[PDB]
Design a protein around this ligand. Structure first.
Ligand SMILES: N[C@H](CCC[C@H](N)C(=O)O)C(=O)O
Ligand SMILES: N[C@H](CCC[C@H](N)C(=O)O)C(=O)O
Ligand SMILES: N[C@H](CCC[C@H](N)C(=O)O)C(=O)O
Ligand SMILES: N[C@H](CCC[C@H](N)C(=O)O)C(=O)O
Ligand SMILES: N[C@H](CCC[C@H](N)C(=O)O)C(=O)O
Ligand SMILES: N[C@H](CCC[C@H](N)C(=O)O)C(=O)O
Ligand SMILES: N[C@H](CCC[C@H](N)C(=O)O)C(=O)O
Ligand SMILES: N[C@H](CCC[C@H](N)C(=O)O)C(=O)O
Ligand SMILES: N[C@H](CCC[C@H](N)C(=O)O)C(=O)O
Ligand SMILES: N[C@H](CCC[C@H](N)C(=O)O)C(=O)O
Ligand SMILES: N[C@H](CCC[C@H](N)C(=O)O)C(=O)O
Ligand SMILES: N[C@H](CCC[C@H](N)C(=O)O)C(=O)O
Lengths: 297, 297, 297, 297, 297, 297
């Protein structure tokens, strides 16, 4: 009666998913799937590492920790082997489309896909939904950071003269963001041009962007992140109801842990694909339903 | 395609439930049930007011706004007429017991009961559940106020020499509370005895309690309330994950609005009784599932 | 010894002025004056509604709840019938000019005009004045919101292709403001042009302005507002004295309630026109002077 | 048109009153009155120092900087010479009584007495009054410190075995206070007895009191102080209106500066005694009425 | 030119010291010393583990991660082998005494001992020292938590009927602390007696103590901690200078990392024993002195 | 055993250095050096004021309170008389260069120079250094104000049409700054040109700059200042370690007091020049080493 889980892809959240699975008494790690099976860091010395999930035998659910571009085709194929999928698919504009592509397949093979089950999308999605349950009229804002931005880091690293780069994301309220960019230059490159180029780039040209040159970019890195959500609005006909939610957290630690919670929940839903706002919150937790109700409600 | 709702009982949250229903385009108020039908305040001039729900014709769901002691027997009888119930039943220790008493009846008549659907229990219950989904190990604290305490107000009002009383509830962190009590005395009563009596009473004897004498107690009343919840804990094996949620809100405004959200949700569940941590969050909301996902997730 | 009050005009603050008058035991509502007497919303079913203040008999004071452009001529005419005026006239640059136009008339007919008696101008005006009484040298800043901006909403609504609009006002400190604008477009209009047009407009071209397109603009509305005032400065020869005042409030609720307080005060001043910084604070309050001093000083 | 001021008494606030007068271009220091004229500290090397106000010639107003017990008889006698009085008389329970004793005398000699014109009573008094003007129903709390407490310091210093003592006042919210007491003992005295004696004393027996023994008590002294006031309440019929005021200030710097502002104001009132909630706020300020209105309202 | 370090003792901070050493390019881990050499957890599979430091060959410095009672005799013996010691010796009252016992020995063998180099004592010690450098007169307070208390946990665990226990430490300001205690009872023990016993115990009888019974005590544990230090005081003759320092941190992560910084610094001091307030701050850092000055000063 | 100190230069910090020296029992003020000896304000009535340090006899150390441009040549010459120097030399980019110019001279004459010993550079420098000792990897930000900016004030005052000017420095986080500029114009100057000129100037053209015209610029001046430093980073391998330090302070009061602390420390170092991150923190303090350790560590 132990939930049998495979970690597919082993990026930044990969190592943390390993820890989150190991830490859950109700889960059993049946192995790690990845492209390069010979790259075996410290923590995978004693873990089965394959490039094909079928070699791991019986698997209830797969934590997809792959790049964003890979998640769709990868989920389709693992659902098709009669295994559940959980992913942290992070592109909001495409979530509706991903859900219905995976629903077709999930239903055919009588399995469950939980999608976009990180912290945003994920956790924060539920808190945003609760805010409209409490006060349907009014405005919600979601403020991110301070934290590293992999997307914007890549966009900076991809510009003329830039050896390495790091974009930080700074909240300025009402969903507005400042971008602090730290760069190493390539032997003999013009800072002022790199600066102007980064600010003019389409990934930065909408935002207050600041660029500083540095020696080692890696020594500035910290996987700490944060959100501050607010809702101001109306319960029935009563205005100026004020709600607020904040966390200062380790990014991959949380992303991975919520995926493990989603996986637990995936085992209890009727066949199909779900966003996390379509799952009963208590389904995410381990323990006796009645002890959990006594403790939480 | 309008959800047809009756308000049963018309206490403090009664008037606010009226506003919350009227404000929801997807609801139709089919009338108000109560013991004294001749008490008809401003807002019920034009509303059907009966002492018998059967006179209202077809009703999908009933918002129970009766005293705590009445909710169980009242829900049983309205479920038995083939109507759904939503209540803000506020006694945590008895929620598990109420759920299973109402489940029996709800299932027999093929209806839904959503129970303890205020803000605590209610909203806060979901946020407490999300906190364990994000970080299962660690401590959660729920800090209440500043706000009026009806229970402790009554306990003070019921002591020798006390004409009127008001207990405020002040948060001091880690679920610890200070109680500020304001009293009018009866012609010739000894303040020092009333003070000592209130502090010694079993409703106050565990808490830092302060007593001040005043002229009009009514002029101190404000239905404003608040919560500050915190969770410090572990995502997988990563410690010192910090989560926090705060609101400054109108108490009955919110309680009533969340009951209306629960009623909306009640129409979509399989027959039985539910706490709000057993309902998909999005079921609480009005609108097209796909627009809501696009907006929230 | 009951203060006899007429509400002249019935806009947004009109309904709230009705509530503030009704709530004050020391006031008697002698009726509501307005252009269209046949528009009779819920709360005026039982209230005298005339299109001429003379039909209400003896009236001590009039709460002018008309548009900004109407206040001057309207106050002149009601003072001229031997009635006191209170208004929330909200154009700071014109307050000195309005005071002396109303002083002439108020003195001739032996009556009192209290002007600009909202929260800003109004309440905040007194706190700004107290800050110089405590520390005459140094800087004061007044930070507004988050709150709706009717002026900027109208300026946005009045641009090509815009069906409806809503400007929010966001405080960024030191009196600097961000403007968040939400718009519905008219069937086939170009977002990018409307966006650029709004940002270029004279109401927005000085401020960090952001424009988002939305479905229902009404569902974003909340009459909640707020101020954070600061003063850093010198008491005698001692520097770095720090003062701060904040509120999160229902906008029209407060505006109307302070007008009722100003009306109470108007009954105690020598004939003429006054800003609220020229009235003894205690004159705004109901009750026995000696009980109020005992309670407050 | 220069206001001619004498400083009577030269305690702690004495030196600061000197600075506040000197700093005000609209004031002329006509001298300092005191018991011992031969005690002439640094700042009074160049200032007229008499033991009798009559030697200073024509004086518009006197800043009484004497001990609390002396203010009543001292104000009576200076009013009786046809001079205005300002004091920071700090005993709230006795303000109503002091006002009417000074009113009798002030009226007889056609002069003005402003009383209890420090920061509490004083400044804070006006902000407490404004809070009821904005929201008459609800609760106000006044939280003091962290700051030195001269009254409680003296009560500690007056106990067996105590060489020197210092009581700090710590705000714990809702007007509740913690008292931190630091003591030097006399050669061979029992700490545990002194501790228990201080906690049992009538000045401390109501409050959370902590006692630490220390070497130099003087090196812990700082004249910094602070207040955090809150009001939660009702504007008309709208609940959960939230108001807040905070300052971190030099205690005597502010007390003295507000007395100088009160003195300025005293010159503009009809004969009699006033609390500061009975004076128009703008009367406290220097400058042209129309520039001040333009700047503040 | 790599600093050769041995970890002596392997408690809670032991594993974290391993990570802090490994993470420092300027250090080389020459092995781990401990009482039970056969207990070899995950991370020590490939690390030399001895019960005698002499088996590790050449060692510049030893991180003592032993119990408090062991540190003195253990430091004496390792200094005596011509190796440097760093410890987080956490008993403030005994630091002066430990320094001079280790100074004698350190000087004899021409080595360095850095003592009490955690975060308190340690980091916080330097910030407390800086506060007197900036403002020698006035008060400093050090507020701990929320965090686990091993000392108080042990004192609770050692009482009749208590299977397991956990004491949390909650800051209430001005160095005052609340203790939240969570206990498992032994089959058939009386909660009310255990509660009373814990509150009466000498480790708790001075503090606001609260006791709750729970199922699993281990699932409440989180190694997160925090400090909030304040100083209010006088720079020269200028009062009300306000300073503040806060951190929310992983306890052992920080303790261990600061010991590694102290070890780096130990290599640069003249022979003897030191508290961390006796070491130049820059000596704690790796890198070129002139680059570090350019970056920090 | 008194430290004998001369104040050389008497600018803004000059007067405050006088107070800081006088306030330190362990110091003796042997006199003040300056260019204009006939300018003798209140506090220098009784102090020896020479234009030549040699007239003061024996001097252990000199507090250089001269302009930035003078400090180098002035320190060289006073070191050369066998006297120690302390300065608040405030140009970060040139600190490394100044240290080594003064080291040469300090060593030749067997004396000590402590340089850049204000609060930034100074105090803040030590806190920035401690942050890397606690968490070497991650980002530190230093946020200044709100406070006056002498440099930017001068740059504004030096533009066409500007009679007087004041630049305030406002922190917006992540080392980003807003500049609020207040100007008096010269009889017949165009505001819009002066505004544009100030914004375009090289001292402002990188920063969010706002310009307001005013009557008296002097009445806006307050020497209050502040810093908020943050560090987010890694202790060993543990991420999201959060550190924060804030102060609200009198600028020259603090600068001068830390120079007096540096002077005390200068008496204990081997001959040479030092930044404050190269001095043992406890060397800054007066008192018995063992009492200080007992009190702080
Ligand atoms: N991996 C995270 C990334 C979302 C946060 C992103 N919006 C940012 O501001 O960095 C998640 O979706 O769970
Ligand atoms: N580094 C974080 C945030 C990604 C956000 C970044 N993709 C962007 O918003 O540009 C992550 O692993 O989710
Ligand atoms: N009827 C309220 C009770 C909230 C206040 C209560 N939890 C307390 O302050 O002790 C609700 O949950 O909707
Ligand atoms: N006024 C709130 C809270 C009452 C909370 C009650 N449990 C108490 O503490 O007395 C209500 O109407 O539910
Ligand atoms: N009508 C309001 C105006 C205040 C808010 C306005 N100053 C803003 O910028 O939002 C009043 O008289 O109270
Ligand atoms: N606040 C005002 C309208 C003006 C909004 C203010 N921001 C502006 O238009 O300048 C009101 O609610 O009547
Ligand atoms: N002497 C002060 C008293 C204020 C502080 C006092 N209320 C306290 O509890 O500290 C004044 O008149 O401004
Ligand atoms: N604050 C007053 C003294 C009284 C202190 C107050 N806490 C008390 O004694 O009750 C002062 O500085 O003159
Ligand atoms: N290991 C830590 C413990 C000190 C914190 C302790 N005072 C507490 O409140 O838990 C250290 O000295 O580095
Ligand atoms: N658990 C923490 C704190 C110890 C504090 C505890 N010993 C007490 O103050 O009772 C540590 O490992 O340092
Ligand atoms: N002279 C000051 C400069 C501080 C202010 C400056 N860092 C800025 O605000 O830009 C000091 O370090 O003592
Ligand atoms: N008023 C401060 C700060 C000047 C900072 C200067 N760097 C500038 O930004 O202009 C001082 O006297 O040092």
């Amino acid at each position: 009666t132990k939930i049998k889980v495979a970690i597919v892809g082993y990026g930044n959240i990969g190592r943390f998913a390993l820890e989150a699975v190991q830490a859950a008494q109700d889960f059993e790690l049946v192995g790690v799937v990845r492209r390069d099976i010979n790259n075996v860091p410290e923590e995978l010395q004693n873990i089965t590492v394959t490039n094909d999930i079928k070699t791991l035998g019986d698997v209830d659910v797969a934590l997809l920790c792959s790049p964003t571009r890979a998640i769709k085709e990868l989920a389709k194929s693992i659902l098709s082997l009669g295994i559940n999928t959980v992913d942290s698919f992070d592109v909001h504009s495409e979530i509706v489309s991903l859900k219905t592509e995976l629903d077709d397949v999930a239903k055919k093979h009588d399995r469950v896909a939980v999608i976009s089950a990180g912290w945003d999308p994920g956790s924060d999605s539920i808190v945003r939904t609760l805010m409209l349950a409490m006060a349907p009229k009014g405005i919600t804002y979601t403020n991110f950071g301070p934290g590293m931005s992999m997307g914007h880091s890549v966009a900076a690293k991809a510009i003329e003269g830039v050896k390495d780069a790091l974009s930080m994301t700074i909240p300025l309220g009402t969903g507005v963001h400042r971008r602090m960019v730290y760069v190493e230059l390539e032997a003999g490159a013009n800072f002022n041009q790199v600066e102007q180029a980064i600010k003019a780039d389409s990934y930065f040209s909408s935002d207050e962007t600041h660029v500083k040159q540095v020696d080692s970019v890696d020594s500035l890195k910290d996987v700490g992140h944060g959100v501050h959500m607010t809702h101001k609005g109306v319960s029935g006909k009563t205005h100026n109801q004020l709600f607020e939610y904040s966390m200062r957290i380790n990014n991959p630690a949380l992303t991975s842990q919520f995926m493990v919670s989603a996986a637990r929940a995936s085992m209890k839903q009727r066949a199909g694909a779900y966003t996390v706002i379509e799952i009963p919150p208590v389904d995410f937790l381990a323990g006796d339903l009645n002890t959990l109700i006594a403790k939480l409600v």
